[PDB]
Write a protein that binds this ligand. Structure first.
Ligand SMILES: O=C(O)CNC(=O)C(=O)O
Ligand SMILES: [Mg+2]
Ligand code: NI
Ligand SMILES: [Zn+2]
Length: 331
């Protein structure tokens, strides 16, 4: 079995290997990359996402989210308070202000220590989940707006044509902006490109050990667990590496820098934080190997998780027994 310790693998495809996206994912899996739940892909030196980032300031962040924490430094939840709209240029200036900017630090490890010590005492503002793309239309390789759609994959594998679309999302971050522990909708893959700015640190639990994380989360967030049998779908809970290590939960960590891709694999729980002002683009995708994970994915039916239009068909076709209850939670 390849990669039996479930380490995060880093790949350096050549420009020739960068042509066929599906083929390269299957290659990474042949080497055991999926066992970690997360992989890094460094694009060939010849590749670029677009020519420059000089003209992005007028993008609108319609609903910036202030991420307010509750709990203790290593075990907390966050809620999202909606703020007034602002442009990317306005948000960049805010991120660089004395109130929100990255503190002085020695290296990524020092910054990680400072994040876990101090996150809860601040409320950073995240421009998340903005439909759109920063890939140039002429970028033919690993263009996250030109991927094969999940609806087409389901149709190719299973023969059933379904409604829905699959488009990318932009994320504008600042110091301490935080992504809570989650797997993707329907335990899909994700791919994330860091277009510009400061790094993003990731934590990930191997898919084979995801239920260990779920059991700890039920212990640590006991009211939330009584409220919903899949409350991590709410995307609000954080648990630090120190707490994971104290409770014996297998995990790994890595820092993504500008110009690098990350892939999350089906049922790979992940969480993380931004180091400073940045912009990332991410989208969900599927492969043949995902289908079995989609069929087994947990679902929130309490009403909290509320997701896209396109998830309806996935539930309806892959999980017909759950459909009625889940749809009630959507309505
Ligand atoms: O970058 C972020 O805030 C969160 N991204 C992801 O969870 C992802 O790409 O799957
Ligand atoms: Mg602009
Ligand atoms: Ni994710
Ligand atoms: Zn729920």
């Amino acid at each position: 079995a390849q990669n039996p310790n479930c380490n995060i693998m880093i790949f350096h495809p050549t420009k020739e290997e960068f042509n066929d996206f599906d083929k390269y994912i299957a290659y990474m899996e042949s080497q055991g990359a999926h066992r970690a739940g997360l992989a890094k892909i460094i694009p060939p030196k010849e590749w670029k996402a677009r020519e420059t980032y000089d003209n992005i300031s007028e993008i609108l962040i319609a609903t910036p989210l202030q991420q307010v924490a509750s709990g203790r430094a290593g075990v907390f939840t966050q809620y999202h308070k909606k703020k007034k709209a602002m442009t990317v240029g306005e948000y960049r200036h805010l991120a660089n202000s004395k109130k929100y900017q990255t503190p002085p630090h020695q290296n990524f490890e020092d910054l990680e220590r400072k994040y876990w010590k101090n996150r809860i005492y601040n409320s950073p503002i995240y421009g998340a989940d903005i439909s759109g793309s920063l890939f140039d239309e002429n970028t033919k390789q690993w263009n996250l707006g030109h991927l094969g759609t999940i609806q087409d994959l389901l149709e190719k594998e299973c023969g059933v044509v379904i409604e829905g679309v699959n488009t990318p999302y932009l994320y504008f971050g600042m110091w301490k902006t935080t992504f809570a522990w989650h797997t993707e909708d329907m335990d899909l893959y994700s791919i994330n490109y860091l277009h510009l700015g400061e790094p993003k640190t990731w934590y990930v639990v191997p898919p084979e050990h995801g239920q260990r994380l779920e059991r700890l989360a039920r212990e640590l967030f006991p009211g939330s667990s009584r409220g919903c049998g899949a409350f991590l779908r709410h995307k609000v809970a954080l648990i630090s590496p120190t707490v994971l290590k104290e409770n014996g939960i297998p995990f790994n960590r890595i820092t993504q820098e500008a110009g690098e891709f990350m892939v999350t694999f089906p049922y790979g729980y992940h969480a993380g934080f931004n180091h400073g002002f940045n912009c990332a683009e991410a989208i969900n995708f599927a492969t043949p190997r995902w289908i079995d994970y989609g069929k087994m994915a947990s679902q929130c039916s309490c009403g909290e998780a509320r997701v896209t239009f396109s998830m309806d068909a996935f539930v309806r076709i892959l999980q017909p027994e759950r459909y009625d209850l889940w749809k009630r939670g959507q309505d």
